[PDB]
Amino acid sequence: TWALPTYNNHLYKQISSQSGASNDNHYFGYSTPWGYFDFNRFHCHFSPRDWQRLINNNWGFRPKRLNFKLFNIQVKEVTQNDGTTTIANNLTSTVQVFTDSEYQLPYVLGSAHQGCLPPFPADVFMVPQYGYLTLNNGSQAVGRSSFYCLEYFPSQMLRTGNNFTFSYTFEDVPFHSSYAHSQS
Amino acid sequence: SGNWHCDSTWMGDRVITTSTRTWALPTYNNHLYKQISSQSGASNDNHYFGYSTPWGYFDFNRFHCHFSPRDWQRLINNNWGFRPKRLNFKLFNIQVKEVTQNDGTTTIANNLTSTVQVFTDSEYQLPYVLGSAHQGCLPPFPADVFMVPQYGYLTLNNGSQAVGRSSFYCLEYFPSQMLRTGNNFTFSYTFEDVPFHSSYAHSQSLDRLMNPLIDQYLYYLSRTNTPTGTTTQSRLQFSQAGASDIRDQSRNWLPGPCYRQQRVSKTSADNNNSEYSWTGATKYHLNGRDSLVNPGPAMASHKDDEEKFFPQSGVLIFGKQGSEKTNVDIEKVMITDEEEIRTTNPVATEQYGSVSTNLQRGNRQAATADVNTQGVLPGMVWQDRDVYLQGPIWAKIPHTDGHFHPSPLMGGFGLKHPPPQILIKNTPVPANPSTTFSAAKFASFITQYSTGQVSVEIEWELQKENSKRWNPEIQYTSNYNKSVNVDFTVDTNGVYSEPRPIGTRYLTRNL
Amino acid sequence: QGPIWAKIPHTDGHFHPSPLMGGFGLKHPPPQILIKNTPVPANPSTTFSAAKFASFITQYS
């Protein structure tokens, strides 16, 4: 179960280093309202038991396909009259979602950031904000630097009572090695 | 969405029942598992290691959920035996409520599409909680609305210490079907073939089974001394079993097994002046932890004259209506008593008999000892306990290789594959989440609860009464009381009550 | 708890593309999925305002 706040009050931002005089540490980048949930880690998929059962009996393994389905979307509106915090459900107010199979965006995952689906299924987690960096010098940004407006892609629209699926396929890749050799 | 069904129809051989109730499910432990153990209050026999979960489960194991006292009466008189066949189950009319208190004002706002999830398991892969006869049955009386009990289970341990053998579960790991308002749920189950229960008590006791008139042809040792010698005694003599001697007459089959119990009088004057009961208290044990013997092997409570005495343990002691939770005196609680099994099974308080000891000779005088315990032996028969009404229905045979005649000791039908449990849970709905990222587990939530209706239907199968007896029977009848207080009916203020338990053995068959 | 797959940086130069946190280097990893609420405006001004209209209603899903 996932919960999505609203970031930066719906507006892009330029973010850079504070210029704290460390030249090796500087960055030039953009924070966006877009959320993305990113599963790259095992314990999301495998329970310690199944891990144990697989790890003993198999030489190697690789993925083949994967399927993905959202469902049961709903929206909540918080409003505080004076100090009373109140949450009123709403309908037909829409959420929009798009993937890209064309690999046209900066690719954020792979740096092993926290925010995986929680190890333990009981807990409910927030979705991480997006963002990315770009070429720069200190605070200065080159003319080579790029920029994006994510709305520029054909996002499918979702409203309560609607679900979303897409089927993917992994390309053929050599098996991983689960074994260690018996002779040096 | 569904049509309320509470009713029973008589097909002859089979009889169908259905009942329906309204249920309400809170949210337990704020949606998080917990380790629970004993407080370590220094009593080593009392310790536990277990896990409490948010999951609710509603569990019907008792009769009075299914049968109304009338139908009970009508079935109990006319049938030798009965067992279930199938059962059908249907939820419907689910809805959700959200309570929110602004200042001190408690307000409940209905909501839609917020989902409840439910799964059964026909694969028997979970700890099996029912069968210990916990309270929380569907209320006896259909008018009332009841909360669903929280779940939980125990595991191997030592004191507070838990072994490495101990296990754990995450229930979300199963394919729960999802339910949203306007959706209903059904599954059809089937009971496996199991012997009929016995509703009858025999009309003739074992020892007295014989022909009065005809003498059997075997003999027995009559008298040692002719009289005299005396020092030379006398040669053995022989007589025949006859109408005059019932005891010496010979019998094929031996009464059932026994275990001793302690005799407690109702009269405090007769009961032992000093303290007993755990002095005391016949027990068995595992792993150095003595478990007091709760209702045990079947056996008869009392002989004819006493009626005051009752077994200290085996007899089921129910409470009456409005009973106290602790330190309640007897007059508020009902004692069940079985005098009807005197035909076969032994008396509880008494010994099983006497047994030879020494191997006699001229100077060696015979010696015997009262046998305090007897196991099963070839050529033995015994009767199963009564099921009463508020008593349990079925229990699960522990899945194991070792078995002998799997009859539960609270009475009922041992099933190899009992009706699967059903578990139910609300879907957690998050509170206002933090704006910036927080590495925390996000413990905030919105309070709510749900409710709906549940329709349980069982199809019984019967065996009709063929009895050829001449003289009139014994039937169960509520009568002879002119009191203003009516049985099985609400008081003036609407609180239901049950006067006394109702056993199943009324009719009669010859042995 | 370690990572699963990482993307080969799309380039001509390669030698034996095995990520250094361990995993499966993919030429075409599972695509990302992005998700956003639709902004719902607060009470707008009666008369025209040249401003970008920064008011909004707070919510989450």
Distance from CA of B438 to the nearest CA of A (A): 8
Q: How far apart are CA C3 and CA B69, in angstroms?
A: 64
Cα torsion angle, B304, B307, B309, B315, sign: positive
Rounded CA-CA distance B343/A110 in Å is 80
Strand partners, B43: none
Question: Considering only CB atoms, which chain B residues are within 8 Å of A129?
Answer: 437
Which residues of chain C neighbour A150 with C-beta distances below 8 Å?
Answer: 34
Cis peptide before B230 (omega within 30 of 0): yes
3-state SS class at B72: helix
**What type of residue is C58?**
T
| C-alpha closest to that of C25 among B241, A107, B412 | A107
User: E-assigned strands of B206-253?
Assistant: 219-221, 238-240
Tally of CA atoms within 13 A in the half-sphere of A29 that contains its CB:
12
**What resolution in angstrom units was achieved for this structure?**
3.8
Alpha-carbon B432 to chain mean position: 48
Tell the burial category of A95 from Cβ atoms under 10 Å away from its Cβ (0-12, 13-18, 19+).
Answer: buried
For residues B207 and B251, is the Cβ–Cβ distance under 8 A?
yes
Phi, psi dihedral angles at A148 (to 5 degrees): -145, 155
How is residue A149 written in tokens?
A: 């407006």
Instruction: Name residue, tokens 């008869």.
Output: B300
Which pair of tokens denotes residue B428? 């957690």
Backbone torsion region of residue B283, taken as left when φ is above 0, otherwise alpha when ψ lies between -120 and 50, otherwise beta: beta
Q: How many residues does chain B have?
A: 511
For residue A105, the chain C residues in CB contact (below 8 A) are 32
* Phi, psi torsion values for C17, nearest 5 degrees: -70, 80
H or E segment and range at residue B464: strand B449-464
Set of chain C residues whose Cβ sits within 8 Å of the Cβ of A35: 34-36
- Rounded to whole angstroms, the Cα distance separating C4 from B75 reads 65
Cβ atoms of A35 and A63 within 8 Å: the answer is no
Q: Which residues of B100-117 are buried (b: 16+ CB within 10 A; e: fewer)?
A: beeeeeeeeeebeebbbb
Chains A and C form CB pairs within 8 A to the count of 121
Q: Strand runs (DSSP E) across B156-218, as ranges?
A: 177-179, 185-190, 201-202
Structure tokens at B228: 């005299």
Are A93 and C26 in contact (CB < 8 Å)? no
Torsion of CA C60, A73, C41, A29, to 10 degrees: 60
Residues C3-18 as b or e (16 or more Cβ within 10 Å = b): bbbbbeeeeeeeeeee
Q: List all chains that touch chain C, counting a touch as 3 or more CB pairs closer than 8 Å.
A: A
* Contacts A–B by Cβ distance under 8 A: 60
Give C-chain residues touching A12 at CB under 8 angstroms: none
Which has the closest alpha carbon to B460: B199, B191, B209? B191
**Chain A: nearest CA to B479, how far in angstroms?**
57
Q: Tell me how far apart the alpha carbons of residues A6 and A4 are, in angstroms, rounded to a whole number.
A: 7
Half-sphere exposure of A83 (CA within 13 A, CB side): 1
Quick one: which H or E segment has residue B107? Answer: strand B105-111
Task: Tell me if B458 sits within 8 A of B5, measured CB to CB.
Answer: no
Helix (H, G, I), strand (E, B) or coil at A152: helix
What is the pairing mode between strands A28-36 and A13-16?
Answer: antiparallel
DSSP symbols for A96-113 = EEEE-TT--S---TTS--
SS3 category, A184: coil
Angstrom distance (rounded) from CA B356 to CA B255: 19
- Specify the 3-state DSSP secondary structure of C56: strand
Residue B66 CA, distance from chain mean position? 16
The angle at the Cα of A44, spanning A151 to A154, to the nearest 5 degrees, equals 15
3-state secondary structure of B355: strand
- Residue B187, classed as helix, strand or coil, is strand
Q: Using the beta-carbon criterion (under 8 Å), do A124 and B173 form an inter-chain contact?
A: no
Instruction: Of A82, A72, A89, A86, give the one whose Cα is nearest residue A161.
Output: A72
Return the structure tokens found at B433. Answer: 């989440």
- Residues whose CB is less than 8 angstroms from the CB of residue A11 and which lie 6 or more positions away in sequence, other chains included: A33
Nearest-CA distance from C12 to chain A in Å? Answer: 17
Report the helix count and the strand count for chain A, using DSSP H and E. Answer: 1, 11
Nearest residue, CB atoms, B432 vs list A47, A74, A87: A87
> Is the distance from CB of A124 to CB of B442 less than 8 angstroms?
yes
Are A47 and B100 in contact (CB < 8 Å)? no
Distance CA A123, CA B428 (A): 9
Q: What SS3 class is residue B293?
A: coil
Place of tokens 């199968």: B461
How far does A21 lie from chain C, in Å, by closest CA?
A: 31
What are the distances in angstroms from CA B222 to CA A80, B219, B226, B243?
Answer: 102, 9, 10, 15
**CA distance linking residue B261 with residue B280, whole number of Å:** 10
Experimental method: cryo-EM
| CB nearest A89 (choices: B102, B103, B111) | B111
User: Which residue on chain A is closest to B32 by alpha carbon?
Assistant: A122
- Fill in the DSSP letter of residue B445: B
Q: Which residue from B362, B365, B358 is spatially nearest to B233, judged by alpha carbons?
A: B362
Whole-number Å distance between alpha carbons of B219 and B198? 37
The Cα of B61 is separated from the nearest Cα of chain A by a number of Å equal to 30
Query: Which residues of chain A does C21 touch, with a Cβ-Cβ cutoff of 8 Å?
Result: 112
Between CA B8 and CA B17 the distance in angstroms is: 5
Residue B239 tokens read as 């007589």
Q: Which residues pair with B290 in a beta bridge?
A: B285
Question: Between the CA of residue B469 and those of A60, B13, C50, what are the distances in Å?
Answer: 77, 22, 104
Find the residue in A nearest to C56 (Cα): A9
C-chain residues within 8 Å CB-CB of A60? none
Q: Which residue among B170, B178, B428 places its CB closest to the CB of A124?
A: B428
Distance CA(B216)–CA(B138), nearest Å, equals 58
Between strands A2-3 and A125-126, the pairing is: parallel
- Among B492, B457, B371, which residue's Cα sits nearest to residue B60? B457
For residues C57 and B357, give the distance between their C-alpha atoms in angstroms, rounded to a whole number: 95
**How far does chain A reach from its first CA to its final CA, in angstroms?**
48
Contacts of A122 (CB under 8 A, 6+ apart): B31, B32, B33, B170, B172
Question: Both tokens of residue A7?
Answer: 């970031």
Query: After which residues, if any, is chain B broken (C to N > 2.5 Å)?
Result: none
3 state DSSP class of B448: coil
Give A69's strand partners. Answer: A165
Which residues of chain A have a CB within 8 Å of the CB of C57?
77
Cα(B473)–Cα(B201) distance, rounded to whole angstroms? 12
Phi, psi for residue B449 in degrees, rounded to 5:
-160, 165
Q: Report which of B151, B154, B157, B156 is spatially closest to residue B134, judged by C-alpha positions.
A: B151
Of B263, B341, B347, the closest CA to residue B503 belongs to B341
What element of type H or E holds B77? helix B69-78
Q: What is the DSSP secondary structure assignment for residue B135, as one 8-state letter?
A: S
Q: How far is C56 from chain A (nearest CA, A)?
A: 8
Do residues B66 and B86 make contact, with C-beta atoms less than 8 angstroms apart?
no
Q: Which residues of A touch B31 (CB under 8 A)?
A: 122
Nearest partner of B142 among B2, B5, B323, B319, judged by Cα: B5
Mutation target to probe the A interface, by most A beta carbons within 10 A, among B105, B441, B446 is B441
Contact A168, C31 (CB under 8 A): yes
Return the partners of chain A (3 or more C-beta pairs < 8 Å): B, C
| Tokens, residue B104 | 């001190």
User: Considering CB atoms only, which of A3, A5, A47 is closest to B435?
Assistant: A5
The whole-angstrom separation of Cα C15 and Cα A127 is 35
CB-based burial label for B58 (10 Å; 0-12, 13-18, 19+): buried
